[PDB]
Amino acid sequence: VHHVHPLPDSVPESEDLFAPPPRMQGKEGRPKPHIGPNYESYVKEWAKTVGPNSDEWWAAKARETLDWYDDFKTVRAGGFEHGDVQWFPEGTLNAAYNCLDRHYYKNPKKTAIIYEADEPSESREVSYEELMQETCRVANVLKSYGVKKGDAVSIYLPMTWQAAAAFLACARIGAIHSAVFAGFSAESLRDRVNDCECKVLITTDEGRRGGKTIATKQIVDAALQQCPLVENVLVLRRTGNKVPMTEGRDKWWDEECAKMPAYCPCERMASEDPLFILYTSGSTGKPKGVVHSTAGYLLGTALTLKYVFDAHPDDRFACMADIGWITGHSYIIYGPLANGITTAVFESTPVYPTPSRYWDFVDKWKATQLYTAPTAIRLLRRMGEDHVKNHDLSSLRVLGSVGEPINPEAWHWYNDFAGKNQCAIVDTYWMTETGSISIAPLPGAISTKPGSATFPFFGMDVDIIDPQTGQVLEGNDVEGVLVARRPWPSIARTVYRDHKRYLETYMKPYPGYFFFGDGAARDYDGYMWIKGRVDDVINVSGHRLSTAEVESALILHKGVAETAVVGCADDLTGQAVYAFVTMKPEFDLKATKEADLSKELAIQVRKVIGPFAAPKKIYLVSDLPKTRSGKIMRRVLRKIVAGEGDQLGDLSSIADPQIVEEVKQKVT
Ligand SMILES: CC(=O)NS(=O)(=O)OC[C@H]1O[C@@H](n2cnc3c(N)ncnc32)[C@H](O)[C@@H]1O
């Protein structure tokens, strides 16, 4: 008699609620959680962070968490309507000072970064001392190129530890870094370099990932042929293979830094000075450069890292994402270093050299938290439990999932094998535009449901709106689109040189609120469930189906590895469901009739969800197009089903781009 249902799971609901396990109870010598031990302890604190009396908590947290050069007077001002959001406006600080210097002063030899190289043997620890020195050298290099406060600097770097040095060097001097995924095409890089109008670019000669070479300098040379503003390129010698270097314009990182001293003063930045531009990916049109301020962004990432992952001073936090993704900005670099702990820079893939890489990593470094995307989790689940069963992994207390809904089936695999049923699983919902985690369980306090984001984070006041009426749906057991009622410190302040695009996209669809673009439901118990992108909804004869529920139903079938469902025009039902399925490699599609597997999947969807949810067609494919932003390229599959595959655009964001040519063949 519940209008909203959990994402489909094999475990009955009665047996599917997971209270904080002993490692998250302060037992067995593990640290005490910062918030606990139950749901009410979370509400008691959160209620201090929203509403008309929350200034006090926020003022105290900002003064406790960050080192300031000048105190602020006003806590907050502004709003969504014109996009004039302000937090701590009169304060001054520097992000590099808070992520490096202050920690270097207390414990210089403490490990700031665990650099997990593409080849495991080349891995090493980078202390705060070394990281600060390299950051200062690069900052000195940038100042000699004439970079001033407020100038954009493009960064095209792979996942080597110096990427952190380059982010922080820009922040140290007040420049605005703009990081682009290594491996993006020359065209994509060009569009971002030209939009941010930078005069300096930082890159490598080459990157190494999964044993394959990323030809970064060659791609940069092709892009710069159409980037007339770029005058200096700083090239890090990562592999040492011969690459072209333009005399005058191109200089070697090691040769330039050797000329510079190893300390550099910090630019004193206003709270609202821009910290960075981060261009989103996966759209056809103009790239969208999301801008973040300094003090609110930093405080938000520091508080989320502390509270969502229950970080403590000696923790070794392992976020395995790429720094070209907001997840890397916030939970590799800014969040963890702000808190003064050890953070991971993972250069490889989850299956190089074998699908045991993640767990070999955890046991070698004694990682205490692990944070990756559902795409990685489904991949590891796909390769079998042999690569996980005989690892220790007991250093871990918290496992995190970010970037897409995590199917209960994958949630359980994570819970059973990575955590051995002794970690808390935090499903973190947020966006590039929100700066930091928006909805997630606090692991010492919240009992989890597989596939639920649970409850909003401090400072976040979220609601559900009927998109048909535009009115808020009060109470529980409601479904609609997710909106936030009030600004929060780490919200993006604008889209670079395109504020109108910022207002029209996020602020005007539901005037007075911030519009995430996701469908959501709040269940009988008040847990939030992120259903998927509003754009991915399929309307079958008046029934609106979300992607997370159908993909979750499909993966409950034995042998299914990963799925993706997209809609297309249908005369009978308005829109029809088309499902793309990949199976485990041990599956014998010769012994099983493919017509029979498609029929068994259609029944499984009809049982779990409804009579209307069955797919009209099902395509069996070896893999799906995925990005390093934790997402499946559904728009691409939708266009291919629509016959518009001839003009799909740039697939540079997809991990293995050759897969789209296979999907085209099988759909035709
Ligand atoms: C962090 C990130 O991904 N920033 S992002 O800008 O790259 O994407 C944001 C979009 O990603 C989807 N998304 C991200 N996390 C989850 C999650 N935990 N559960 C369900 N959906 C999720 C959602 O659609 C967002 O709107």
XYZ file of C-alpha atoms and ligand atoms in Angstrom:
694
model
C 0.000 0.000 0.000
C 3.056 2.212 -0.646
C 2.914 4.473 -3.688
C 6.745 4.606 -4.028
C 8.665 1.335 -4.174
C 12.364 0.725 -3.534
C 14.569 -0.058 -6.467
C 14.051 -3.759 -7.284
C 16.105 -6.134 -5.144
C 16.282 -9.880 -4.520
C 16.277 -9.365 -0.760
C 12.759 -8.734 0.586
C 12.273 -5.297 2.101
C 11.854 -6.767 5.593
C 15.478 -8.001 5.416
C 16.997 -5.105 3.398
C 17.776 -2.407 6.015
C 21.406 -2.212 7.145
C 22.252 -0.472 10.420
C 25.819 0.870 10.935
C 28.007 -2.214 11.293
C 30.458 -2.676 14.186
C 33.399 -0.945 12.434
C 31.160 2.162 12.255
C 30.205 1.884 15.948
C 33.573 2.779 17.433
C 34.191 -0.918 18.159
C 37.332 -3.036 17.670
C 39.445 0.039 18.325
C 38.046 1.889 15.290
C 37.426 5.659 15.596
C 34.159 6.915 17.008
C 31.811 8.260 14.321
C 31.385 12.033 14.299
C 27.581 11.654 14.092
C 25.692 8.817 15.724
C 24.411 6.418 16.561
C 21.005 6.606 14.794
C 18.782 8.587 12.448
C 17.730 11.074 15.147
C 21.328 12.017 15.948
C 21.659 13.046 12.298
C 18.467 15.135 12.331
C 19.438 16.867 15.570
C 22.621 18.186 13.953
C 21.182 18.832 10.475
C 18.343 20.929 11.904
C 21.084 23.350 13.009
C 22.239 23.767 9.404
C 18.968 24.704 7.658
C 16.346 27.360 8.312
C 16.286 30.859 9.808
C 18.712 30.147 12.680
C 21.436 28.251 10.866
C 23.815 31.206 10.470
C 25.288 30.384 13.882
C 26.293 26.827 13.015
C 27.646 27.854 9.618
C 29.664 30.751 11.036
C 31.178 28.442 13.657
C 31.960 25.645 11.170
C 33.665 28.064 8.771
C 35.886 29.516 11.489
C 36.721 26.052 12.832
C 37.364 24.311 9.536
C 39.430 26.808 7.505
C 42.324 29.118 8.318
C 41.439 32.680 7.375
C 43.604 35.689 6.714
C 40.669 38.016 7.402
C 37.526 37.093 9.277
C 34.131 37.450 7.604
C 31.263 39.513 9.020
C 28.243 38.424 6.985
C 27.435 34.726 6.817
C 25.243 34.623 3.694
C 23.345 36.769 1.199
C 21.823 36.544 -2.259
C 19.787 33.861 -3.918
C 18.752 31.846 -6.951
C 16.628 34.467 -8.710
C 19.555 36.524 -10.008
C 22.375 34.210 -9.063
C 24.084 36.514 -6.544
C 24.745 33.836 -3.916
C 27.289 35.008 -1.313
C 28.825 33.184 1.636
C 31.299 34.797 4.077
C 31.819 37.691 1.617
C 34.226 39.835 3.662
C 36.554 36.922 4.479
C 39.901 36.259 2.830
C 41.737 32.939 2.638
C 43.745 30.802 0.267
C 42.815 27.242 -0.717
C 46.442 26.138 -1.124
C 47.238 27.430 2.361
C 44.413 25.320 3.768
C 45.237 22.167 1.777
C 49.031 22.361 2.139
C 50.946 24.975 4.143
C 49.031 24.640 7.426
C 49.398 20.865 7.299
C 53.044 21.087 6.260
C 53.689 23.260 9.317
C 52.304 20.643 11.733
C 53.502 17.336 10.221
C 55.611 17.849 7.112
C 56.538 14.203 6.662
C 52.931 12.949 6.773
C 51.767 11.374 3.540
C 49.560 13.752 1.584
C 49.091 11.556 -1.499
C 49.356 7.831 -2.100
C 50.393 7.853 -5.766
C 49.177 4.545 -7.184
C 50.943 4.455 -10.545
C 49.643 2.631 -13.596
C 52.361 0.024 -12.943
C 51.927 -1.050 -9.293
C 55.676 -1.220 -8.553
C 56.176 2.487 -9.409
C 53.790 3.573 -6.648
C 54.988 5.723 -3.768
C 53.900 8.076 -1.020
C 54.188 11.842 -1.515
C 54.554 13.775 1.736
C 53.004 17.174 2.429
C 56.531 18.630 2.258
C 57.192 17.314 -1.259
C 53.706 18.214 -2.502
C 53.984 21.734 -1.143
C 57.393 22.276 -2.688
C 56.275 21.100 -6.127
C 53.150 23.266 -5.866
C 55.248 26.288 -4.934
C 57.737 25.647 -7.765
C 54.936 25.467 -10.343
C 53.275 28.537 -8.835
C 56.559 30.408 -9.282
C 56.714 29.164 -12.869
C 53.203 30.451 -13.565
C 53.978 33.877 -12.075
C 56.999 34.201 -14.407
C 54.639 33.587 -17.331
C 52.665 36.594 -16.137
C 49.661 34.734 -14.731
C 47.771 37.173 -12.519
C 45.026 36.738 -9.985
C 41.809 35.946 -11.867
C 43.461 34.514 -15.034
C 42.266 31.141 -16.298
C 44.817 28.335 -16.696
C 43.892 25.184 -18.586
C 45.064 21.860 -17.176
C 45.150 18.761 -19.405
C 46.751 16.206 -17.112
C 46.359 12.443 -16.556
C 46.104 10.842 -13.112
C 49.658 11.394 -11.910
C 50.249 13.004 -8.540
C 51.538 16.290 -9.991
C 47.990 17.001 -11.179
C 47.295 18.015 -7.580
C 50.369 20.229 -7.651
C 48.967 22.017 -10.706
C 45.467 22.590 -9.252
C 46.956 23.940 -6.049
C 49.545 26.096 -7.861
C 46.735 27.962 -9.622
C 44.818 28.305 -6.353
C 47.980 29.442 -4.557
C 48.341 32.494 -6.835
C 44.645 33.161 -7.399
C 44.485 31.808 -10.913
C 41.389 29.893 -12.063
C 42.225 26.356 -13.121
C 40.088 24.540 -15.698
C 40.798 20.808 -15.801
C 39.954 18.753 -18.901
C 39.919 14.933 -18.861
C 43.119 13.523 -20.275
C 42.068 11.626 -23.366
C 39.509 14.148 -24.537
C 39.839 14.827 -28.248
C 41.643 17.858 -29.634
C 38.279 19.357 -30.604
C 36.834 19.006 -27.078
C 40.013 20.426 -25.541
C 40.010 23.296 -28.032
C 36.427 24.282 -27.180
C 37.209 24.361 -23.471
C 40.547 26.142 -23.901
C 38.947 28.763 -26.120
C 35.903 29.282 -23.872
C 37.974 29.938 -20.744
C 40.312 32.340 -22.660
C 43.411 31.081 -20.835
C 46.934 32.074 -21.856
C 48.709 29.112 -20.196
C 48.194 25.359 -20.530
C 49.647 22.600 -18.342
C 49.896 19.050 -19.672
C 52.095 15.943 -19.894
C 54.107 14.508 -22.741
C 51.925 11.381 -22.467
C 49.676 9.638 -19.996
C 49.647 5.928 -19.070
C 46.384 4.202 -18.104
C 45.689 0.479 -18.220
C 48.951 -0.069 -20.046
C 47.786 2.082 -22.967
C 49.303 5.456 -23.897
C 47.301 8.705 -23.873
C 48.985 10.961 -26.458
C 48.412 14.172 -24.528
C 51.072 16.402 -26.111
C 50.068 15.335 -29.629
C 46.413 16.086 -28.857
C 47.411 19.447 -27.361
C 49.345 20.341 -30.512
C 46.294 19.659 -32.651
C 44.054 21.699 -30.353
C 46.365 24.711 -30.058
C 46.355 25.128 -33.829
C 42.924 26.674 -33.166
C 43.645 28.341 -29.775
C 45.256 31.704 -30.558
C 45.342 33.022 -26.978
C 47.606 30.284 -25.587
C 51.198 31.480 -25.352
C 52.842 29.156 -22.807
C 52.552 25.392 -22.427
C 54.115 23.606 -19.443
C 54.856 19.957 -20.257
C 55.388 17.378 -17.506
C 57.772 14.580 -18.481
C 55.623 11.608 -17.462
C 56.809 8.909 -19.875
C 59.833 10.371 -21.616
C 58.820 9.324 -25.129
C 59.675 11.771 -27.908
C 56.919 14.342 -28.422
C 57.023 17.573 -30.415
C 57.942 20.760 -28.541
C 57.436 24.192 -30.099
C 60.377 26.478 -29.393
C 59.429 29.356 -27.134
C 55.859 28.224 -26.511
C 56.604 24.809 -24.937
C 58.790 24.285 -21.860
C 59.565 21.257 -19.692
C 58.055 21.194 -16.197
C 61.274 19.910 -14.624
C 63.493 22.459 -16.411
C 61.235 25.421 -15.545
C 60.725 24.354 -11.926
C 64.447 23.793 -11.378
C 64.927 27.552 -11.917
C 62.390 28.488 -9.252
C 62.517 28.529 -5.442
C 60.521 25.950 -3.499
C 58.386 28.449 -1.588
C 55.866 30.954 -2.914
C 53.543 33.339 -0.996
C 49.796 32.753 -1.019
C 47.512 35.209 -2.762
C 44.945 36.518 -0.306
C 41.615 35.645 -1.960
C 38.162 36.952 -1.222
C 35.684 34.211 -0.250
C 33.834 34.769 -3.526
C 36.874 34.954 -5.806
C 36.502 32.147 -8.362
C 38.480 29.029 -7.471
C 38.042 27.073 -10.706
C 36.074 26.480 -13.877
C 35.038 22.895 -14.528
C 33.464 22.114 -17.909
C 30.828 19.388 -17.954
C 30.876 16.747 -20.699
C 28.587 14.581 -22.784
C 26.482 17.302 -24.436
C 26.277 18.140 -28.125
C 26.446 21.916 -27.793
C 28.720 24.505 -26.257
C 30.671 23.214 -23.248
C 29.324 24.435 -19.936
C 31.971 25.881 -17.629
C 30.696 25.547 -14.067
C 32.337 28.148 -11.802
C 32.982 27.633 -8.088
C 33.887 30.273 -5.475
C 36.563 29.737 -2.810
C 35.304 29.695 0.795
C 31.906 28.004 0.398
C 33.230 25.363 -2.009
C 36.169 24.550 0.206
C 34.116 24.419 3.421
C 31.484 22.248 1.741
C 34.034 19.747 0.473
C 35.794 19.663 3.838
C 32.590 19.109 5.822
C 31.227 16.474 3.441
C 34.533 14.602 3.495
C 34.604 14.718 7.287
C 30.991 13.710 7.874
C 29.920 11.536 4.917
C 33.058 9.349 5.065
C 33.689 9.815 8.798
C 37.318 10.783 8.163
C 39.735 10.946 11.084
C 43.287 12.376 11.200
C 45.135 9.146 10.328
C 42.751 7.948 7.637
C 43.892 6.957 4.148
C 40.998 7.995 1.889
C 40.939 6.320 -1.536
C 38.823 8.034 -4.164
C 39.573 6.233 -7.443
C 37.970 8.782 -9.812
C 39.666 11.050 -12.332
C 40.492 14.679 -11.506
C 38.759 15.793 -14.711
C 35.504 14.954 -12.871
C 34.012 17.033 -10.094
C 34.465 13.928 -7.907
C 38.235 14.323 -8.299
C 38.204 18.049 -7.544
C 36.222 17.603 -4.341
C 37.174 14.180 -2.939
C 40.679 13.622 -4.191
C 42.210 17.072 -3.779
C 40.250 19.785 -2.001
C 38.201 17.830 0.582
C 40.855 15.406 1.840
C 43.804 17.800 1.769
C 41.727 20.506 3.452
C 41.156 18.010 6.300
C 44.901 17.254 6.376
C 44.681 13.498 5.701
C 46.145 11.103 3.116
C 44.442 10.906 -0.270
C 44.872 8.602 -3.265
C 45.701 9.472 -6.872
C 44.871 6.290 -8.792
C 46.477 6.333 -12.240
C 45.250 2.937 -13.499
C 41.910 1.232 -14.314
C 40.023 -1.214 -12.039
C 41.137 -4.219 -14.147
C 44.785 -3.423 -14.870
C 46.739 -5.504 -14.624
C 43.890 -7.703 -13.243
C 40.419 -7.123 -11.724
C 42.093 -7.446 -8.320
C 43.876 -4.109 -8.635
C 41.484 -2.230 -6.302
C 41.846 -4.818 -3.549
C 45.598 -5.273 -3.960
C 45.633 -1.513 -3.479
C 43.511 -1.518 -0.299
C 45.632 -4.179 1.375
C 48.992 -2.661 0.394
C 48.147 0.842 1.666
C 45.608 -0.093 4.377
C 42.974 2.223 2.932
C 40.199 3.163 5.368
C 37.586 4.400 2.869
C 36.980 3.554 -0.794
C 35.046 5.767 -3.217
C 34.312 4.867 -6.849
C 31.524 4.795 -9.419
C 28.811 2.157 -10.036
C 30.324 1.591 -13.478
C 33.510 0.355 -11.819
C 31.536 -1.712 -9.299
C 29.494 -3.459 -11.970
C 32.673 -4.142 -13.939
C 34.368 -5.780 -10.974
C 31.216 -7.783 -10.167
C 31.256 -8.812 -13.823
C 34.768 -10.330 -13.633
C 33.878 -12.669 -10.755
C 34.481 -12.973 -7.022
C 37.825 -14.770 -7.339
C 39.634 -11.429 -7.517
C 38.084 -10.292 -4.179
C 37.444 -13.363 -2.032
C 40.935 -13.909 -0.589
C 41.884 -10.312 0.264
C 41.840 -8.931 3.800
C 40.263 -5.472 3.152
C 39.623 -4.997 6.877
C 41.297 -1.588 7.004
C 38.156 -0.247 5.304
C 35.223 1.202 7.220
C 33.239 3.072 4.534
C 32.541 2.244 0.881
C 31.218 5.032 -1.328
C 29.359 5.078 -4.628
C 28.977 8.194 -6.818
C 27.828 9.232 -10.294
C 24.674 7.174 -11.022
C 22.045 5.103 -9.229
C 23.631 1.945 -7.840
C 21.451 -1.074 -8.520
C 20.667 -3.093 -5.364
C 22.303 -6.084 -7.056
C 25.606 -4.183 -7.336
C 25.078 -2.609 -3.916
C 24.942 -6.111 -2.450
C 28.061 -7.228 -4.311
C 29.875 -4.160 -2.933
C 28.499 -4.864 0.555
C 29.220 -8.605 0.480
C 32.700 -8.701 -1.048
C 34.426 -5.332 -0.774
C 33.112 -4.706 2.730
C 32.646 -8.342 3.801
C 29.405 -7.137 5.431
C 31.398 -4.938 7.868
C 31.468 -1.567 6.078
C 28.867 1.130 5.758
C 27.920 1.858 2.128
C 27.409 5.563 1.357
C 25.541 6.208 -1.884
C 26.368 9.880 -2.519
C 24.073 11.922 -4.762
C 25.382 15.282 -6.063
C 26.391 17.187 -9.203
C 29.198 19.327 -10.592
C 26.920 22.297 -9.937
C 26.372 21.441 -6.241
C 30.093 21.465 -5.396
C 29.878 18.806 -2.706
C 27.727 15.838 -1.689
C 24.010 16.721 -1.478
C 22.240 13.554 -0.216
C 24.087 10.624 1.393
C 23.934 8.450 4.522
C 26.069 9.522 7.447
C 27.743 6.148 8.041
C 27.775 6.132 11.815
C 24.120 7.215 12.008
C 21.932 6.055 9.074
C 20.635 2.555 8.369
C 20.915 2.019 4.616
C 18.571 0.704 1.908
C 20.279 -0.722 -1.224
C 19.985 1.953 -3.880
C 18.866 4.907 -1.711
C 20.731 8.185 -1.185
C 18.827 8.500 2.182
C 18.859 11.987 3.737
C 20.065 15.489 2.750
C 23.386 16.764 3.966
C 23.987 19.712 6.296
C 22.828 22.949 4.690
C 20.745 21.094 2.096
C 16.967 21.503 2.253
C 15.474 19.415 -0.573
C 11.878 18.990 -1.714
C 9.869 17.051 -4.288
C 7.854 18.969 -6.901
C 5.168 17.635 -9.169
C 6.513 18.627 -12.606
C 2.914 18.680 -13.896
C 1.683 21.320 -11.431
C 4.915 22.860 -10.203
C 3.682 22.490 -6.622
C 5.653 20.936 -3.756
C 4.557 17.501 -2.524
C 4.653 17.563 1.268
C 5.094 14.484 3.392
C 6.292 11.024 2.480
C 5.451 8.489 -0.230
C 5.720 11.226 -2.909
C 7.379 11.182 -6.329
C 8.472 13.959 -8.693
C 11.572 16.029 -9.451
C 14.196 17.005 -6.912
C 14.666 20.687 -6.022
C 16.535 22.549 -3.291
C 14.790 25.381 -1.444
C 17.739 27.552 -0.434
C 21.360 28.194 -1.408
C 24.125 26.216 0.274
C 27.780 27.230 0.636
C 29.286 25.148 -2.197
C 26.657 25.845 -4.874
C 28.133 26.908 -8.191
C 27.970 30.657 -8.600
C 27.708 30.873 -12.395
C 28.500 29.294 -15.768
C 31.633 30.949 -17.120
C 30.771 34.088 -19.122
C 27.260 32.687 -19.548
C 25.233 33.537 -16.470
C 21.983 33.490 -18.480
C 22.615 29.813 -19.209
C 23.090 29.311 -15.452
C 19.761 30.973 -14.577
C 17.767 29.353 -17.376
C 19.081 25.876 -16.628
C 18.927 25.709 -12.824
C 16.851 28.641 -11.501
C 14.004 29.404 -13.907
C 12.389 25.948 -14.548
C 10.850 26.074 -11.039
C 11.091 29.723 -9.945
C 12.328 30.016 -6.382
C 14.155 26.655 -6.360
C 17.300 25.043 -7.700
C 16.508 22.353 -10.274
C 18.846 19.325 -10.240
C 17.414 17.715 -13.375
C 16.852 14.365 -11.644
C 13.659 12.501 -10.897
C 13.257 11.532 -7.268
C 10.926 9.892 -4.779
C 10.759 10.039 -0.984
C 9.540 6.769 0.485
C 7.298 6.040 3.448
C 10.282 6.261 5.806
C 11.504 9.574 4.332
C 14.428 8.048 2.423
C 15.164 9.720 -0.911
C 15.526 7.634 -4.046
C 17.172 9.149 -7.101
C 15.329 7.647 -10.080
C 17.520 8.950 -12.933
C 17.802 11.891 -15.289
C 14.492 13.580 -16.152
C 15.698 13.388 -19.779
C 15.919 9.592 -19.537
C 12.238 9.098 -18.646
C 10.234 6.896 -21.018
C 6.471 7.498 -21.177
C 4.787 4.220 -22.172
C 1.065 4.837 -22.804
C 0.913 7.366 -19.971
C 3.193 5.415 -17.610
C 6.457 7.235 -16.857
C 9.322 4.752 -16.357
C 12.671 5.769 -14.855
C 15.946 4.144 -15.862
C 17.060 3.075 -12.392
C 14.049 0.843 -11.734
C 14.129 -0.997 -15.081
C 17.901 -1.480 -15.148
C 17.643 -2.644 -11.528
C 14.941 -5.125 -12.489
C 16.992 -6.392 -15.431
C 20.153 -6.999 -13.400
C 18.230 -9.330 -11.040
C 18.360 -11.903 -13.826
C 21.224 -14.373 -13.515
C 24.210 -13.592 -15.736
C 23.290 -9.950 -16.432
C 26.310 -7.687 -15.953
C 25.143 -4.176 -16.934
C 22.059 -2.774 -18.658
C 20.831 0.475 -20.189
C 17.273 1.317 -21.273
C 16.285 4.184 -23.579
C 12.989 5.205 -25.148
C 11.956 5.778 -28.743
C 8.827 6.919 -30.544
C 6.119 4.243 -30.755
C 2.723 4.554 -32.449
C 0.901 2.208 -30.049
C 2.348 3.362 -26.703
C 3.751 6.830 -27.466
C 7.210 5.665 -26.408
C 8.669 2.161 -26.301
C 11.450 0.714 -24.147
C 14.627 -0.567 -25.770
C 17.093 -2.385 -23.517
C 20.830 -2.837 -24.043
C 22.181 -5.808 -22.076
C 25.678 -7.126 -21.424
C 26.239 -10.517 -19.808
C 28.974 -12.010 -17.676
C 31.768 -13.474 -19.849
C 31.146 -16.995 -18.492
C 27.656 -16.959 -20.094
C 27.005 -19.371 -22.983
C 24.693 -17.519 -25.380
C 24.972 -20.482 -27.769
C 23.367 -22.928 -25.322
C 20.724 -20.405 -24.257
C 18.544 -19.169 -27.104
C 18.879 -15.365 -27.305
C 15.158 -15.162 -28.090
C 14.551 -17.101 -24.863
C 16.777 -14.853 -22.723
C 14.963 -11.773 -24.058
C 11.617 -13.343 -23.129
C 12.837 -14.218 -19.617
C 14.077 -10.631 -19.148
C 10.748 -9.193 -20.289
C 8.909 -11.351 -17.736
C 11.380 -10.312 -15.006
C 10.679 -6.639 -15.733
C 6.905 -7.245 -15.834
C 6.993 -8.982 -12.450
C 9.264 -6.565 -10.583
C 7.776 -3.350 -12.000
C 4.549 -3.519 -13.992
C 2.731 -4.859 -17.048
C 3.708 -1.675 -18.937
C 7.473 -1.787 -18.284
C 8.463 -4.646 -20.627
C 10.909 -3.709 -23.429
C 9.657 -3.940 -27.014
C 13.189 -4.926 -28.059
C 16.370 -6.056 -26.313
C 19.865 -5.800 -27.844
C 22.635 -8.032 -26.463
C 25.972 -6.188 -26.642
C 29.493 -6.832 -25.393
C 29.707 -3.510 -23.510
C 27.993 -0.141 -23.098
C 29.385 3.393 -23.688
C 30.537 4.786 -20.319
C 32.334 7.954 -19.267
C 34.785 8.684 -16.477
C 31.992 10.772 -14.910
C 30.356 7.543 -13.679
C 27.606 7.573 -16.300
C 26.310 5.510 -19.199
C 25.900 7.360 -22.513
C 22.138 6.888 -22.784
C 21.666 9.884 -25.092
C 23.970 8.131 -27.585
C 21.987 4.889 -27.440
C 18.720 6.830 -27.742
C 19.886 8.510 -30.948
C 21.116 5.177 -32.339
C 17.701 3.588 -31.688
C 16.099 6.659 -33.332
C 18.231 6.074 -36.444
C 20.171 9.296 -35.853
C 23.480 7.444 -35.328
C 25.079 8.997 -38.419
C 25.375 12.341 -36.548
C 26.257 11.554 -32.904
C 29.141 14.018 -32.458
C 32.328 13.599 -30.399
C 32.569 10.359 -28.380
C 35.844 11.423 -26.719
C 34.265 11.132 -23.277
C 33.498 7.415 -23.673
C 36.052 5.056 -22.107
C 36.295 2.541 -24.994
C 34.947 4.596 -27.919
C 34.989 1.677 -30.403
C 31.898 0.238 -28.635
C 29.523 2.681 -30.365
C 30.418 1.109 -33.729
C 29.299 -2.272 -32.359
C 25.999 -0.877 -31.052
C 25.348 0.652 -34.486
C 25.902 -2.736 -36.160
C 23.606 -4.692 -33.825
C 20.771 -2.136 -33.847
C 20.935 -2.241 -37.681
C 28.869 13.678 -8.876
C 28.503 13.723 -10.343
O 28.271 12.696 -11.008
N 28.436 14.959 -10.869
S 28.017 15.082 -12.413
O 27.867 16.479 -12.718
O 29.021 14.427 -13.207
O 26.700 14.333 -12.633
C 25.605 14.632 -11.794
C 24.462 13.714 -12.209
O 24.899 12.346 -12.125
C 23.844 11.530 -11.579
N 24.266 11.006 -10.263
C 25.401 11.334 -9.631
N 25.470 10.657 -8.465
C 24.353 9.909 -8.370
C 23.881 9.033 -7.394
N 24.604 8.794 -6.266
N 22.689 8.431 -7.599
C 21.976 8.671 -8.715
N 22.413 9.501 -9.675
C 23.595 10.139 -9.509
C 22.643 12.430 -11.401
O 21.891 12.362 -12.608
C 23.234 13.809 -11.300
O 22.301 14.797 -11.751
